[PDB]
Design a protein around this motif. Structure first.
Motif, PDB file in Angstrom:
ATOM      1  N   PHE A  90       1.025  -1.285  -0.134  1.00 18.78           N
ATOM      2  CA  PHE A  90       0.147  -0.006   0.287  1.00 18.78           C
ATOM      3  C   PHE A  90       0.893   1.176   0.031  1.00 18.78           C
ATOM      4  CE2 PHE A  90      -4.350  -0.957   1.517  1.00 18.78           C
ATOM      5  CZ  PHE A  90      -4.076  -1.932   1.014  1.00 18.78           C
ATOM      6  N   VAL A  91       0.704   2.578   0.257  1.00 17.58           N
ATOM      7  CA  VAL A  91       1.100   3.395  -0.566  1.00 17.58           C
ATOM      8  C   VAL A  91       0.271   5.241   0.144  1.00 17.58           C
ATOM      9  CG1 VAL A  91      -0.049   4.292  -2.363  1.00 17.58           C
ATOM     10  CG2 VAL A  91       2.584   3.549  -2.696  1.00 17.58           C
ATOM     11  N   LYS A  92       0.893   5.637   0.494  1.00 21.62           N
ATOM     12  CA  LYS A  92       0.919   6.914   1.363  1.00 21.62           C
ATOM     13  C   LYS A  92       0.371   8.326   0.432  1.00 21.62           C
ATOM     14  CE  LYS A  92       3.298   8.344   4.600  1.00 21.62           C
ATOM     15  NZ  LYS A  92       4.743   8.546   5.655  1.00 21.62           N
ATOM     16  N   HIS A  93      -0.779   7.989  -0.015  1.00 15.20           N
ATOM     17  CA  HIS A  93      -1.273   9.398  -0.728  1.00 15.20           C
ATOM     18  C   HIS A  93      -1.657  10.644  -0.059  1.00 15.20           C
ATOM     19  CE1 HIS A  93      -1.908   8.330  -5.284  1.00 15.20           C
ATOM     20  NE2 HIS A  93      -0.409   7.667  -4.505  1.00 15.20           N
ATOM     21  N   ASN A  94      -1.181  11.396   0.248  1.00 14.27           N
ATOM     22  CA  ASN A  94      -1.930  13.230   1.371  1.00 14.27           C
ATOM     23  C   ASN A  94      -2.294  12.099   2.259  1.00 14.27           C
ATOM     24  OD1 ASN A  94      -2.565  13.910  -1.192  1.00 14.27           O
ATOM     25  ND2 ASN A  94      -1.540  15.282  -1.289  1.00 14.27           N
ATOM     26  N   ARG A  95      -1.213  11.603   3.543  1.00 15.19           N
ATOM     27  CA  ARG A  95      -1.681  10.829   4.710  1.00 15.19           C
ATOM     28  C   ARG A  95      -2.484   9.928   4.618  1.00 15.19           C
ATOM     29  NH1 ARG A  95      -3.105  14.856   9.302  1.00 15.19           N
ATOM     30  NH2 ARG A  95      -3.591  12.762  10.388  1.00 15.19           N
ATOM     31  N   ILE A 123      13.923  -0.171  -3.821  1.00 16.96           N
ATOM     32  CA  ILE A 123      14.170  -1.056  -2.974  1.00 16.96           C
ATOM     33  C   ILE A 123      15.316  -1.582  -2.878  1.00 16.96           C
ATOM     34  CG2 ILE A 123      12.693  -2.410  -0.751  1.00 16.96           C
ATOM     35  CD1 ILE A 123      11.038   0.166  -1.146  1.00 16.96           C
ATOM     36  N   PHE A 124      15.326  -2.950  -3.721  1.00 21.74           N
ATOM     37  CA  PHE A 124      15.726  -3.807  -3.619  1.00 21.74           C
ATOM     38  C   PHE A 124      17.982  -3.544  -3.382  1.00 21.74           C
ATOM     39  CE2 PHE A 124      18.102  -7.003  -5.624  1.00 21.74           C
ATOM     40  CZ  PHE A 124      17.917  -8.341  -4.884  1.00 21.74           C
ATOM     41  N   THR A 125      17.776  -3.358  -4.979  1.00 22.57           N
ATOM     42  CA  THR A 125      19.522  -1.931  -4.966  1.00 22.57           C
ATOM     43  C   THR A 125      19.504  -0.775  -3.949  1.00 22.57           C
ATOM     44  OG1 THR A 125      19.067  -1.516  -6.867  1.00 22.57           O
ATOM     45  CG2 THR A 125      19.092  -3.318  -7.876  1.00 22.57           C
ATOM     46  N   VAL A 126      19.804  -0.853  -3.020  1.00 18.38           N
ATOM     47  CA  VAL A 126      19.184   0.278  -2.248  1.00 18.38           C
ATOM     48  C   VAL A 126      19.805   1.268  -3.375  1.00 18.38           C
ATOM     49  CG1 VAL A 126      19.799   1.795  -0.016  1.00 18.38           C
ATOM     50  CG2 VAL A 126      19.771  -1.480  -0.725  1.00 18.38           C
ATOM     51  N   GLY A 127      19.245   2.027  -3.773  1.00 16.76           N
ATOM     52  CA  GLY A 127      19.502   3.663  -4.922  1.00 16.76           C
ATOM     53  C   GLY A 127      19.092   4.990  -3.852  1.00 16.76           C
ATOM     54  N   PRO A 128      19.669   6.115  -4.351  1.00 15.33           N
ATOM     55  CA  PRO A 128      19.944   7.227  -4.072  1.00 15.33           C
ATOM     56  C   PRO A 128      18.786   7.981  -3.375  1.00 15.33           C
ATOM     57  CG  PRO A 128      20.825   6.773  -6.086  1.00 15.33           C
ATOM     58  CD  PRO A 128      20.280   6.145  -6.186  1.00 15.33           C
ATOM     59  N   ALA A 134      11.296   6.091  -1.846  1.00 18.46           N
ATOM     60  CA  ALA A 134      10.757   4.778  -2.050  1.00 18.46           C
ATOM     61  C   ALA A 134      10.036   3.342  -0.624  1.00 18.46           C
ATOM     62  CB  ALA A 134      11.714   4.197  -2.612  1.00 18.46           C
ATOM     63  N   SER A 135      10.769   3.840   0.336  1.00 16.90           N
ATOM     64  CA  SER A 135      11.017   3.554   1.420  1.00 16.90           C
ATOM     65  C   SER A 135       9.378   4.239   2.450  1.00 16.90           C
ATOM     66  CB  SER A 135      11.306   2.455   2.288  1.00 16.90           C
ATOM     67  OG  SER A 135      12.286   3.311   2.638  1.00 16.90           O
ATOM     68  N   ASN A 136       9.594   5.416   2.479  1.00 13.67           N
ATOM     69  CA  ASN A 136       8.273   6.199   2.833  1.00 13.67           C
ATOM     70  C   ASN A 136       7.154   6.208   2.552  1.00 13.67           C
ATOM     71  OD1 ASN A 136       7.835   8.871   3.936  1.00 13.67           O
ATOM     72  ND2 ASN A 136       8.502   7.688   5.809  1.00 13.67           N
ATOM     73  N   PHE A 137       7.474   6.012   0.871  1.00 11.59           N
ATOM     74  CA  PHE A 137       6.081   6.525   0.674  1.00 11.59           C
ATOM     75  C   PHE A 137       5.392   4.961   0.707  1.00 11.59           C
ATOM     76  CE2 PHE A 137       3.786   6.178  -3.932  1.00 11.59           C
ATOM     77  CZ  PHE A 137       3.467   7.757  -3.828  1.00 11.59           C
ATOM     78  N   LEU A 138       5.889   3.528   1.139  1.00 12.94           N
ATOM     79  CA  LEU A 138       5.176   2.976   1.245  1.00 12.94           C
ATOM     80  C   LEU A 138       4.406   2.685   2.040  1.00 12.94           C
ATOM     81  CD1 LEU A 138       7.547   0.433  -0.379  1.00 12.94           C
ATOM     82  CD2 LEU A 138       5.204   0.552  -0.844  1.00 12.94           C
TER      83      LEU A 138
END
Lengths: 149, 113, 147, 134, 132, 187
Positions: free
Chosen positions: B23-28, B59-64, B69-73
């Motif tokens: 799931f993902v976070k769209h305006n809280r 996320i898998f290959t930990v990118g810049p 990418a992980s606080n979006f979730l």
RNA sequence: UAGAGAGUUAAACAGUACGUGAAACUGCUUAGAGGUUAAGCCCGAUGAACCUGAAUAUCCGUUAUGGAAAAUUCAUCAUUAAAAUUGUAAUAUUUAAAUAAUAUUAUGAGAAUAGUGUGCAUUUUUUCCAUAUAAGGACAUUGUAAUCUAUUAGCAUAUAC
RNA sequence: UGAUAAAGUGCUGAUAGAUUUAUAUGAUUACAGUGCGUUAAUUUUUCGGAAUUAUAUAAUGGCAUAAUUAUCAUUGAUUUUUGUGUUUAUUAUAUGCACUUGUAUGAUUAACAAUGCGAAAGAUUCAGGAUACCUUCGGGACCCGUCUUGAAACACGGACCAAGGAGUCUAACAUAUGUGCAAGUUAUUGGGAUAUAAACCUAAUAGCGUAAUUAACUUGACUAAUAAUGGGAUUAGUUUUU
RNA sequence: CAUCUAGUAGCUGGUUCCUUCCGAAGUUUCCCUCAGGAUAGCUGGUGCAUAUAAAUAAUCUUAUCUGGUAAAG
RNA sequence: UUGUAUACCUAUACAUUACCGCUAAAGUAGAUGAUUUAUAUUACUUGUGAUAUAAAUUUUGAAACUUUAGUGAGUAGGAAGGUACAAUGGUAUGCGUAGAAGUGUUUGGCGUAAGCCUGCAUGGAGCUGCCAUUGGUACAGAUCUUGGUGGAUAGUAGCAA
């Protein structure tokens, strides 16, 4: 005349204690009655919130008469509202036809104080008592203060 | 440590958690996925993430933009394992649960995803 | 406490309402100093105001589609939600299912060397047709070297 | 004082026709020109002249004698007939609900009046229909 | 029968029983009608197992079918004949129930006028006097 | 189990006036339409200030409005006061001003009009400036209240200066022990 | 004393606990059951009793046909008499210049109301009924089969290390 | 040999659930699939059949170098931005018009079939119902009020019913909100005018406010006619303004 | 006996409708104070200032300062 | 008992889903020929647009509707909304000897709940919904107050100097 429907006697029906606790619930006077004891167990409440309670700073005027220190005052700040409404700027033509003879004892005022920022026109003020800066800004614009009762 | 287990995910475990559980976070608010427009509308002007496999990449290959990418979730509200647990109050290396399982976080995500 | 009583004036009781209450320019004659109360709203028709082409030329848009839009499908037992979210799932899902259909033919051929019946339609349509469609890729090596 | 949006807020919680009815939170109001008796904003008494009232009959049980809109040309200070202008279709069901959607070239209250008229005609249909029941 | 609502829903009731005041069986001075127990030790209030349940708001009815009678309709009290004509336009969503203090003389107009307007009444044939 | 939802989870703004004035709630009807359909923060300030109390909408003088109007490059703007506009008799020449206020005082009305400029209501402003162009959005000084000087008293600190609650004025009224170094101490 | 029968009364369940006549508490009737925390209770069912709600016309269609009636402004129209609406114009009023709004007039197009007539149905207009396609279809209660979510169990087509 | 890992790998059999008043105030939206479609070769079972190869553009791999960038260890190996052909593979775009019982129905649950007709007044069929019970059975289940760290307590009260029964009025202040007017404000002691203990009008005062300080005597808030506290900082807004 | 008198009580007892939301304290100082206050803390209500960064604020890593307890003697 | 193995069972926990609330966010308000939608004529692009003629939906208690998310322990205590009782001012062209208030009840219901509506039975002359403003406004307890009643007990209490 007051509601009771909105009062909270009507919402505490029926919960046992009526706002007041099981433990130390509403008893008659558990600190005393009124302003006592202000120096002992209510000491902190009287200083803070009321410092200068308990003492004596002095000169006893047996029979004060408040008709002695009466003195209604008026700043230079207003002073032009006293003279009528259109002469405000009917004299700033430019045409110095007019220093308005103002008599403050007919307006109920007895002293003219000076907080001011006054305009550059002459006036003729007639107060009882003077502020020193009042008479220094009215003389600075060509005015007086006729020292009259 | 005693309230937590962790380990080192596979690629398959990165996908199955974002496909099935992501799931993902769209305006809280918490918004499922159901299409690529829920990921793209919030991470393509700033960051360069429009797909799901974008979000699986950084996320898998930990990118810049891993921070985004992980606080979006949302946090992955996982099920309960099938077969359940081991002890829950010993270390993994004692007799099993909390702390670093380290590659056996994969087998436990098959039960929870 | 409710407004709207049916009131019948006479005419010399209607002449005197400009004296009792004031006027919208001057004060009253009989209520010394009274001015009429000013409203918080002069125009007060919200229907004329919401039309209104001073207001209407500055508004944004009603942009209209309403987004009910819910159910999360599982893209591991769905394919039409997996091939929507990740195209290139389709590419390898086809590329392995086509190779899985090609591993079948090499097995049922190599098993049936002890029976080797047909070659027609029944248990060897999905076998011996594609065993002889390698003649259909004899063209691709032969006739495509004209470029 | 002139507006209907002002007029409503003065009446939207107490008027002589508001019917509060204990559970389903507000559907009812009984004023003679409503068309769907609800207290909504302007399904209402006075709208200042788009008060459309579809009523029977006058000759019960004839037809839908429509109290129409009363519009501008009297003040809207009301009658001894002055403000109300009252025209009534008849003869059918299909050829007077078209000559009432046609008397209302302007569309907003029409379909409340095309359902109040289509239910007045049904309300005097049992004098021809639903016979002796042997 | 008469004019059944507007493609009716299937009403799901969270529980059918009512709520009984604690210890109201022990005393004939306690009605059963729910009072919240305030007492400091009360095992109902502290929600121990086996006890009588309390009304929280998870028990509340679906908002579609709240106040719907079993026959589909919400209810509308009718007190005279002009109040029935308010239901001319609401007969797909409302019943009508004649007020208990409407006489037999005047209940006859109301059941008459509610076949014309096709209002389904909840208590027809009450206070008759089914004779002439 | 999850964590942990005290406050101010429920935000404690206003979403409506507490006010049964019908002319005021007709302006809330405009300005919810105006804020939602023109997303100017001008119209959201007018809406949110139209909900407010009598405190938080303090008055504003006719001389403070004439003196905020010495804003440069602004010869043609409107003075917007969600609040009242009071007369000042310490202002001898009223300039030519355009004033939008809920209540303009009566004597402030004539001195604006004899100059002469405009008193407008907030629907004569919604037509002239639906986005609040040419506007001077001004409010009064909130903590000019006398009640604000009494917040709040506990001597020891040289900040204090915070106005005790006391029935009369003079000596005999809270001026000895704690006020005065020859009586106890100075506070 | 009274009981029973009469009798008065609209009514003695109004006859001096004289309006109504509650609860506690029980005499009698009636219906089940009884060594099973002392009873009572909660939840989920149960036997018996009682009660509540519930089809308004087709597949892969609010059908082609065929019949029947009747308005007699409508019938398509043409013609007439009105009543308002909308939009122009103008005048007097407010708010004095325009602006607006209100009356009082006029104007146009389009509608609607009542009257007459190629016609009363000239093939149309309103208003009813048997006749096709896949069915009594709709309704509720079931069984079936398929889909989607969440989930349980089981097999094995190959690759890598 | 086994173990670990990965590939809608695939298949099978189940269980429970299925908001959805598609306008009591916003397109059934787009996707995709199926039906007539210039050809020409190459095959296929030979049936209305079926497969393949042939069209441009854009990539992407595998391979062969040539650069380049930069690093575990460097006999080499890994790696970034490239380049071009050698090449051999794979994807994408180039599907317009009309029609149809093929997805999100933009929380999808929708179909075939069986039973049963809502009879003029009144049966019946199916499902449901702690209505106040009774019957039956399994699980749960201590007696409430109270003070208490802790009550089922061998703490106190309460045998049972009905009626009565406990946070008020007032003076004063505070904060908050409502309302009116606003350098004001408030007639409310009175007097008028009458229509009735109300309502109406109103003089002169007065309260509070607009000026404070000091024990008191004194004294009393800057040259803004034009600087909101003067100046600074943080500053929502403004045809501002570039 | 009647009244003052409904004398006072930091003490015992009781304090009467439902649902929804938020949710304590047994500690500080001071008091002829220790069965009690007032005080601060903890609570709620009501707002208000900032919604088609580089504002900050709170447990770790880094940098630095502090410490005399375990151990050691 | 110690060390292990698989397979199960079990919460109000966890996941999904249905429903209630609360919280937080977002949308919607040209009705005059306003907006669409399906056809039917023309400018023309191949196609779309415009005029015209063929059916509806919408006056969203602007305190209303619509959309999406999360969330749910509670004494002392605070706060919102809701419900019972009695009145006063308005209001319902309300109800009522063709039966009001009250009471009784396996009449049927509605409400998460306080409570409400309804049938029948008794009863015999008054009463209710809404808006406001209220008040001597809601009881299980107080060794509460007044009254009535039950067991104990028709009695091994007893009526024996």
């Amino acid at each position: 005349m007051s509601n009771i429907k909105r009062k909270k006697t009507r919402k505490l029906r029926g919960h046992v204690s009526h706002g007041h606790g099981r433990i130390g619930k509403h008893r008659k006077h558990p600190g005393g009655r009124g302003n006592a004891g202000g120096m002992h167990h209510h000491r902190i409440n009287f200083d803070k919130y009321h410092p200068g309670y308990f003492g004596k700073v002095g000169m006893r005027n047996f029979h004060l008469r408040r008709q002695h220190k009466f003195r209604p005052e008026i700043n230079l700040d207003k002073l032009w509202s006293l003279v009528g409404a259109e002469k405000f700027a009917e004299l700033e033509k430019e045409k110095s036809t007019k220093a308005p003879v103002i008599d403050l004892v007919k307006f109920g005022y007895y002293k003219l104080l000076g907080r001011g920022h006054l305009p550059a026109r002459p006036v003729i003020v007639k107060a009882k008592y003077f502020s020193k800066k009042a008479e220094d800004k009215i003389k600075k614009a060509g005015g007086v203060c006729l020292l009259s009762a | 440590e005693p309230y937590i287990t962790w380990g080192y995910p596979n690629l398959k475990s990165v996908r199955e958690l974002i496909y099935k559980r992501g799931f993902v976070k769209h305006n809280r608010q918490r918004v499922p996925i159901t299409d690529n427009f829920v990921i793209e509308r919030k991470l393509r002007q700033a960051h360069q993430i429009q797909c799901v496999e974008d979000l699986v990449h950084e996320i898998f290959t930990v990118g810049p933009n891993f921070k985004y990418a992980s606080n979006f979730l949302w946090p992955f509200k996982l099920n309960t394992p099938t077969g359940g647990w081991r002890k829950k109050a010993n270390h993994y290396v004692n007799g099993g649960d909390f702390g670093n399982r380290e590659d056996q976080i994969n087998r436990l995500l098959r039960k929870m995803v | 406490g409710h407004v709207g009583r049916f009131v019948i004036w006479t005419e010399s009781a209607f002449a005197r309402l400009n004296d009792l209450f004031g006027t919208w320019k001057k004060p009253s004659t009989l209520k010394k100093g009274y001015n009429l109360p000013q409203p918080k709203m002069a125009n007060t028709d919200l229907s004329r105001l919401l039309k209104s082409e001073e207001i209407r030329k500055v508004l944004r848009d009603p942009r209209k589609r309403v987004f009910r839009s819910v159910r999360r499908l599982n893209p591991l037992t769905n394919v039409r939600q997996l091939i929507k979210l990740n195209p290139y799932a389709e590419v390898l899902k086809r590329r392995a299912a086509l190779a899985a259909e090609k591993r079948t033919v090499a097995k049922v051929l190599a098993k049936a060397k002890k029976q080797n019946v047909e070659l027609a339609k029944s248990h060897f349509a999905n076998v011996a047709t594609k065993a002889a469609a390698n003649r259909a890729k004899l063209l691709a090596a032969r006739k495509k070297k004209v470029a | 004082a002139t507006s209907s949006h002002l007029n409503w807020l003065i009446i939207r919680n107490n008027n002589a026709f508001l019917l509060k009815k204990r559970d389903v939170k507000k559907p009812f109001s009984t004023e003679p020109n409503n068309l769907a008796s609800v207290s909504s904003y302007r399904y209402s008494g006075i709208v200042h002249k788009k008060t459309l009232g579809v009523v029977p009959a006058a000759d019960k049980k004839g037809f839908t004698a429509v109290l129409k809109k009363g519009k501008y040309a009297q003040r809207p200070a009301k009658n001894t007939v002055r403000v109300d202008f009252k025209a009534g279709p008849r003869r059918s069901l299909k050829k007077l609900k078209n000559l009432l959607i046609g008397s209302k070239y302007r569309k907003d209250l029409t379909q409340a009046a095309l359902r109040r008229a289509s239910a007045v005609l049904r309300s005097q249909k049992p004098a021809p229909v639903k016979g002796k029941k042997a | 029968m008469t004019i059944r609502p507007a493609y009716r829903p299937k009403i799901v009731k969270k529980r059918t029983k009512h709520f009984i005041r604690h210890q109201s069986d022990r005393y004939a001075k306690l009605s059963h009608k729910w009072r919240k127990p305030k007492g400091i030790d009360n095992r109902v209030r502290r929600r121990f197992k086996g006890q009588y349940l309390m009304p929280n708001i998870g028990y509340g009815s679906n908002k579609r079918t709240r106040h719907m009678l079993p026959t589909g309709f919400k209810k509308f009290l009718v007190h005279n004949v002009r109040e029935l004509e308010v239901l001319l336009m609401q007969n797909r969503v409302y019943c009508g129930e004649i007020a208990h203090g409407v006489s037999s003389k005047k209940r006859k107009e109301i059941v008459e006028r509610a076949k014309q307007l096709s209002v389904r009444l909840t208590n027809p044939n009450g206070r008759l006097r089914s004779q002439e | 189990g999850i964590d942990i939802n005290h406050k101010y989870d429920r935000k404690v703004r206003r979403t409506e006036p507490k006010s049964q004035d019908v002319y005021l709630r007709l302006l809330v009807k405009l300005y919810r339409f105006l804020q939602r359909r023109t997303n100017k923060k001008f119209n959201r300030i007018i809406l949110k200030r139209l909900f407010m109390s009598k405190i938080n909408r303090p008055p504003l003088s006719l001389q403070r409005i004439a003196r905020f109007f010495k804003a440069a490059n602004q010869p043609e703007s409107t003075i917007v006061v969600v609040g009242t506009v009071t007369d000042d008799a310490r202002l001898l020449v009223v300039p030519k001003l355009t004033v939008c206020a809920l209540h303009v005082t009566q004597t402030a009305r004539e001195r604006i009009l004899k100059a002469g400029g405009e008193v407008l209501t907030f629907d004569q402003l919604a037509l002239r400036s639906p986005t609040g162009k040419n506007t001077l959005l001004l409010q009064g000084r909130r903590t000019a209240r006398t009640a604000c000087k009494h917040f709040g008293k506990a001597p020891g600190v040289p900040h204090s200066h915070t106005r005790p609650y006391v029935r009369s004025k003079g000596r005999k009224f809270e001026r000895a022990r704690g006020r005065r170094s020859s009586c106890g101490y100075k506070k």
